[PDB]
Structure formats: C-alpha cells, structure tokens
Design an enzyme around this catalytic site. Structure first.
Site, PDB file in Angstrom:
ATOM      1  N   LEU A 101       0.844  -0.911   0.062  1.00 28.98           N
ATOM      2  CA  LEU A 101       0.098   0.096   0.233  1.00 28.98           C
ATOM      3  C   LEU A 101       0.890   1.149  -0.064  1.00 28.98           C
ATOM      4  O   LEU A 101       1.995   1.327   0.744  1.00 28.98           O
ATOM      5  CB  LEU A 101      -0.867  -0.070   1.127  1.00 28.98           C
ATOM      6  CG  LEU A 101      -1.558   1.141   1.635  1.00 28.98           C
ATOM      7  CD1 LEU A 101      -2.598   1.512   0.485  1.00 28.98           C
ATOM      8  CD2 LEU A 101      -2.248   1.160   2.837  1.00 28.98           C
ATOM      9  N   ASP A 166       1.990  -1.224 -10.902  1.00 26.33           N
ATOM     10  CA  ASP A 166       1.371  -1.474 -12.105  1.00 26.33           C
ATOM     11  C   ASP A 166       2.038  -2.844 -12.619  1.00 26.33           C
ATOM     12  O   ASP A 166       1.804  -3.139 -13.882  1.00 26.33           O
ATOM     13  CB  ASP A 166       1.194  -0.406 -13.122  1.00 26.33           C
ATOM     14  CG  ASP A 166      -0.336   0.231 -12.944  1.00 26.33           C
ATOM     15  OD1 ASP A 166      -0.676   0.203 -11.845  1.00 26.33           O
ATOM     16  OD2 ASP A 166      -0.597   0.425 -14.179  1.00 26.33           O
ATOM     17  N   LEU A 167       2.573  -3.809 -12.014  1.00 28.26           N
ATOM     18  CA  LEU A 167       3.517  -5.176 -12.418  1.00 28.26           C
ATOM     19  C   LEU A 167       2.247  -5.708 -12.990  1.00 28.26           C
ATOM     20  O   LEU A 167       1.327  -6.106 -12.355  1.00 28.26           O
ATOM     21  CB  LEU A 167       4.011  -5.385 -11.123  1.00 28.26           C
ATOM     22  CG  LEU A 167       5.297  -4.467 -10.700  1.00 28.26           C
ATOM     23  CD1 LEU A 167       6.134  -5.038  -9.480  1.00 28.26           C
ATOM     24  CD2 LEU A 167       6.360  -4.208 -11.700  1.00 28.26           C
TER      25      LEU A 167
HETATM   26  C1  LIG Z   1      -4.134   2.771  -8.126  1.00 34.23           C
HETATM   27  O1  LIG Z   1      -4.373   4.240  -7.702  1.00 34.23           O
HETATM   28  C2  LIG Z   1      -4.005   4.717  -6.457  1.00 34.23           C
HETATM   29  C3  LIG Z   1      -4.300   5.805  -6.152  1.00 34.23           C
HETATM   30  C4  LIG Z   1      -3.763   6.476  -4.980  1.00 34.23           C
HETATM   31  C5  LIG Z   1      -2.977   5.819  -4.183  1.00 34.23           C
HETATM   32  O2  LIG Z   1      -2.655   6.287  -3.089  1.00 34.23           O
HETATM   33  C6  LIG Z   1      -3.024   7.538  -2.519  1.00 34.23           C
HETATM   34  C7  LIG Z   1      -2.782   4.536  -4.582  1.00 34.23           C
HETATM   35  N1  LIG Z   1      -1.965   3.559  -3.599  1.00 34.23           N
HETATM   36  C8  LIG Z   1      -1.543   2.530  -3.898  1.00 34.23           C
HETATM   37  O3  LIG Z   1      -0.965   1.736  -3.146  1.00 34.23           O
HETATM   38  C9  LIG Z   1      -2.239   1.706  -5.041  1.00 34.23           C
HETATM   39  C10 LIG Z   1      -1.881   0.305  -5.500  1.00 34.23           C
HETATM   40  C11 LIG Z   1      -0.387   0.267  -5.476  1.00 34.23           C
HETATM   41  N2  LIG Z   1       0.129  -1.265  -6.039  1.00 34.23           N
HETATM   42  C12 LIG Z   1       0.416  -1.393  -7.528  1.00 34.23           C
HETATM   43  O4  LIG Z   1       0.843  -0.529  -8.333  1.00 34.23           O
HETATM   44  C13 LIG Z   1       0.774  -2.783  -7.689  1.00 34.23           C
HETATM   45  C14 LIG Z   1       2.093  -3.366  -7.533  1.00 34.23           C
HETATM   46  C15 LIG Z   1       2.405  -4.713  -7.958  1.00 34.23           C
HETATM   47  C16 LIG Z   1       1.443  -5.301  -8.767  1.00 34.23           C
HETATM   48  C17 LIG Z   1       0.161  -4.757  -9.153  1.00 34.23           C
HETATM   49  C18 LIG Z   1      -0.103  -3.581  -8.658  1.00 34.23           C
HETATM   50  I1  LIG Z   1      -2.921  -1.828  -9.201  1.00 34.23           I
HETATM   51  C19 LIG Z   1      -2.912   2.500  -6.287  1.00 34.23           C
HETATM   52  C20 LIG Z   1      -3.096   3.745  -5.482  1.00 34.23           C
END
Ligand SMILES: COc1ccc(OC)c2[nH]c(=O)c(CCNC(=O)c3ccccc3I)cc12
Length: 279
Positions: A101, A166-167
């Site tokens: 996160l 975004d992996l």
């Molecule tokens: C998706 O839009 C956002 C908007 C705002 C965010 O924080 C304010 C987000 N924080 C996060 O941890 C995330 C998820 C992060 N995780 C990833 O990107 C990820 C990593 C490995 C594999 C797949 C992934 I959708 C999203 C997010």
C-alpha cells in the site's frame, strides 16, 4: 478480532486472509483501490479492484501466469504484489489485486503539485526507477513493464524513494486495440503499437518519464488525439517539450532513451553507468 469502529470490513479473499475495508484510497482508469488488511500479518495492504471488463481467453491466462511470477519479488524500488483473484459482490464482478500500500500516491500527482523538480531529486528518483527496471529485467524469465508512466510510479513519502507499480497489468492493456478518444491522448514506444517489444520498451518509457519530470508537462500536449501522436512517434518527431529541457546532461540522457529505433537506445546498464547517475 477486527474492531470496526469507523470502517466496516466489506470483503475477503477465499481463505479470508485478506479483508477489504470500505475506505477508498484512490481511483484511476479501470480500477478503484481500497484500504485492506493482511490478517496473517496485521499489515495494511492495497485492495485494488479492476473494472469489470470481459477479457479474452488469452488475456486471462497471460495475466494469471504473470501474476504468479510477481509473488515472491522483493526490491526497494518495486511495489510488492501479494495476490489476485476474481471477485463479486451484488451485481458487480471484478479482478482484485492485493499489493503493498502506497498512501502517498503517484509521481503524476506529485508533479501536478510541484511543477519544479530539483536536479538532485530528479537524479536520485530516476536512478531508483532504473534499479527497479534492472531488477525486473533480470528475473527469470525477465519481467518487462511495458506501460511504465508517472501514473504508476509511487512515492514512499515527500522525501522518500520511488517504487514501480502496475506490475503485470500491461497484459490487460489493449495496446493494439482501437480505443475511444477520452482524456489526455497517450503515446507509446514506436514498436509497442504492434507489440513487437523487448526490454528497450521500458527504456523509452523511462526517458519519457524523465522528460516529464524535467519539464513538468505530459509529452505531446500539442496533439489533440492519439492518432496525431502515433504519426509523430512512428516518424521520429519528438514532443515539443523535448526542446524545453534546461539542463544539457538530462536532455542527452532523454535523447539516448527515446530513440525511434529500439536497438539504438541506451541499455539500462549504460544508463546506470552514466556520469549523471554515478554522482
Ligand atoms: C491505483 O491508484 C491509486 C491511487 C492512489 C493511491 O494512493 C493515494 C494508491 N496507492 C496504492 O498503493 C495503489 C496500489 C499500488 N500497487 C500497485 O501499483 C501494484 C504493484 C504490483 C502489482 C500490481 C499493482 I494495481 C494504487 C493507488
């Protein structure tokens, strides 16, 4: 037991290891992200819900395979992936990812707030992205991002490092598909419009990320649609913003990165070896 003082748990993985909370963390594109919990560990995670879309057979299989391979991966400049599965509640179906996160959100958001980057920060963050890419590219098999952008690079903290997110989701990008004209028109690497790519697609994307960081605009804002952009990209025409890079050494690196012919581009190895990145 889970206290639900302010937030109710509103979903679970099959085994109930992961829980979803009715706190939205963020929205973008074809996903909503919720606050989640890994109950094994008591560690908060991102519960990412991808838009209900019918996927082709190939898409489903590519994705489940790539997902599996992410599972163990640990590196400072990569957002960790934990698990994913198909989910429904009431009339809505979706794919869930549970990942590390990132509560400080994206590079894009940051760049919207702070329109002038310090060279020191640009150097250190770009280096981290490269370390991330190099980690991915050297897995077995190599993982190529294929859709790297400021929108999916995450900051740990205002003075923290960056992590690539975004992996694996590129598998669900329909890069070769016809698509609706909505939002800011996107570019991709010349060869990627026909999905004839390798590791060097990430180098091109990296260069475009660096350009954006240095100029504080999305490249090709002079175009109204992705068709105009396509014609420029595939004919060697750089984005106007290229000429607005103030600092010669940054411009050189970008130039090395965003070359039309993929084979002519810097390698990651080169870039990490470059004076600019060698302090
Ligand atoms: C998706 O839009 C956002 C908007 C705002 C965010 O924080 C304010 C987000 N924080 C996060 O941890 C995330 C998820 C992060 N995780 C990833 O990107 C990820 C990593 C490995 C594999 C797949 C992934 I959708 C999203 C997010």
């Amino acid at each position: 037991d889970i206290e639900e003082l302010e937030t109710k748990a509103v979903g679970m993985s099959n085994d109930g290891r992961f829980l979803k909370f009715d706190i939205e963390i963020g929205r973008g594109s074809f996903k909503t992200v919720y606050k989640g919990l890994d109950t094994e560990t008591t560690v908060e995670v991102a519960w990412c819900e991808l838009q209900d879309r019918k996927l082709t057979k190939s898409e489903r299989q590519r994705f489940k395979e790539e997902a599996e391979m992410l599972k163990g991966l640990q590196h400072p400049n990569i957002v960790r992936f934990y698990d994913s599965w198909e989910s429904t509640v009431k009339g809505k179906k979706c794919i869930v990812l549970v990942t590390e996160l990132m509560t400080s959100g994206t590079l894009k958001t940051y760049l919207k707030r702070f329109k002038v980057m310090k060279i020191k920060v640009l150097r250190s963050w770009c280096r981290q992205i490269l370390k991330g890419l190099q980690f991915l590219h050297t897995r077995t098999p190599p993982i190529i991002h294929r859709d790297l952008k400021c929108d999916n690079i995450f900051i740990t903290g205002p003075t923290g490092s960056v992590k690539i997110g975004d992996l694996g989701l590129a598998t669900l990008k329909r890069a070769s598909f016809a698509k609706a004209v909505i939002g800011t028109p996107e570019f991709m690497a010349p060869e990627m419009y026909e999905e004839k790519y390798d590791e060097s697609v990430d180098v091109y994307a990296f260069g475009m990320c660096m350009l954006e960081m240095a100029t504080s605009e999305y490249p090709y804002s002079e175009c109204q649609n992705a068709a105009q952009i396509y014609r420029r990209v595939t004919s060697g025409v750089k984005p106007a913003s290229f000429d607005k890079v103030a600092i010669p050494e940054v411009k050189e690196i970008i130039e090395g990165c965003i070359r039309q012919n993929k084979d002519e581009r810097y390698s990651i190895k080169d870039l990490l070896n470059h004076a600019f990145f060698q302090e």
